[PDB]
Structures are given as structure tokens and as C-alpha cells.
Amino acid sequence: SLKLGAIFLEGITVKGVTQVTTQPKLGEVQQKCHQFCGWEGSGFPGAQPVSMDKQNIRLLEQKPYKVSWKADGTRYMMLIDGTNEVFMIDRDNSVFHVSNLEFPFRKDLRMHLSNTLLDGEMIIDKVNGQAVPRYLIYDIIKFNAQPVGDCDFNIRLQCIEREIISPRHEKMKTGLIDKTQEPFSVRPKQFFDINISRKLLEGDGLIFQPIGKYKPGRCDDILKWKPPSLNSAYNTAMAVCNSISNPVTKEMLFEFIDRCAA
Ligand SMILES: Nc1nc2[nH]cnc2c(=O)[nH]1
């Protein structure tokens, strides 16, 4: 099913970012995404976290995790496959084509990456007191057709910096990649050791990612945390309702992580 009139970012208008409705390009982009994620269904192949609760919270002492700010952005998978073949995919499976957002190859800046699929969200940051869209790279499923998604989270984060972010910065500072003519900025999401979650909540929640490998669908492994208050499908919301009866206070969390901490 197609969604006509799809919006890339409610509010701000982004030139260079237009929804793909033409075929076969639409089915090709979607198909390629599903194959990279090894998803069989038809919906969003991307990974779906689950709200933290007094039960799965124990997973933090059972294996290595990383944490980071839980922004209020729009989820989007970015399929980078060749020059002028940069596409954004949302939860509704809508596809948007992005013009002038180049992704050079680490070894040959005149080359362009392909068979690459990033995962992250779209945010509307305020710079100099003005709306400016940014894409935060959370994960990376496939790099140049390589199953980097199967690697630990550590390696995937390095791949993004080393393979995606670094090359782009090189061509901007050396070649002709004007960050002002680009549709939006591409910055990497930053993760830290969970034994410092506290520091992140002082300056809107947290998200705990395990070192395991990328997995599409529902990941009861990935825990997103949101204050008991301001805490918003039926089955999905069902885990949000019973979560209100026995909520994980910011204290319960920190205290738990401190107990676990080495
Ligand atoms: N793992 C993961 N969690 C998210 N939470 C919001 N966006 C994302 C994402 O792209 N990946």
C-alpha cells in the first residue's frame, strides 16, 4: 500500500528531499532494505526497542550495554546505494529520495558507497536560533554489501565513524561538499558506558543497546527508558499501561546500574 502526500519532517520543509512514488524504483528500494535486514514480513524491517520494566531491567547486569540520549526524532532507515541513490525509509515504508547528500568511499573520495544501509532518526535541531534538520546515525546494517550488522555494536559504531562520517568530513574540508547546500547534516549518534547514565540526565529519556548483533523486528533486548511521568497498538501500549503500575523510577535505574557496575 502507498501513502500519497507523505511528509519527511512535520514542520520544516526540506528541499532536495522528495518522496519516491515511481516504480520499480519504489519496490527496488524497499526490497533491497528487507533483504539487508533479512526481514520476511512486509512492514518496517527495522529494529523495534521495548520499554524498560522491573523485569528486563535485570538484563543490564547480565551482559554489556551502551547508553545514549533518547531523542524525539522520526525513525528513518537510509539506503545508500550508488551516486544519487540515497533514500530514506520510515515506519510506514514510505520512501524519500535525497538529492545532494554524497557518501564518498573512505579510500577513493571520487567513488560513492553503495549496498549500504544506515539506521537512525531525523531530528530538528535549533542552531543559532533556527530550525535545522539533522540525521543521527544509530546503527549500520550493511556496508558495501558487507554484513557489518552481524558484528558487535562496538565494530558497527567504528564502521560508521570510520566508513561513513570520516570520508564525508574529508571531502567537505578538502573537496567540494558544501554542508550548506546539503539537505541536512549527518552526525553519528554517540553511546557511552552505562555506568554514566546519570550524567546524561541533568542538562527526553535513555536507550540501552546491547553489544549483540543487529536484529530486525522486536528486540526485547534493546530497552528504551522514559520517565514514569510523560510516559505515553494495544499490545504495544499494553506494555505501557502495566508499566505505569510498577514503573522504573530514575532512582531504581541508577541504583541498579551502580550495583552492577564493576
Ligand atoms: N536501535 C535503534 N533504536 C532507536 N530508537 C529510535 N530510533 C532508533 C534506531 O534507529 N535504532
Short overview:
This is mRNA-capping enzyme. It is found in: Nucleus. The chain is α+β, with helices and mostly antiparallel strands and about 260 residues long.
CATH topology of the domain at 1-46 and 71-189: D-amino Acid Aminotransferase, Chain A, domain 1
CATH-scheme architecture of the domain at 1-46 and 71-189: 2-Layer Sandwich
Number of helices: 6
The number of distinct β-strands equals 14
Q: Helix amount, in percent?
A: 10-25%
Rg (C-alpha, Å): 19 Å
CATH superfamily of the domain at 1-46 and 71-189: DNA ligase/mRNA capping enzyme
How do the helices and strands follow one another from N- to C-terminus?
Answer: EHEHEEEEEEEEHEEHEEHH
CATH class of the domain at 1-46 and 71-189: Alpha Beta
Biggest pleated sheet? 7 strands, mixed
- State which percent range the strand residues make up: 25-35%
Structural class assignment: alpha+beta
Family: In the N-terminal section; belongs to the non-receptor class of the protein-tyrosine phosphatase family. In the C-terminal section; belongs to the eukaryotic GTase family.
Active site: 70
Region (GTase): 5-262
Subcellular location: Nucleus
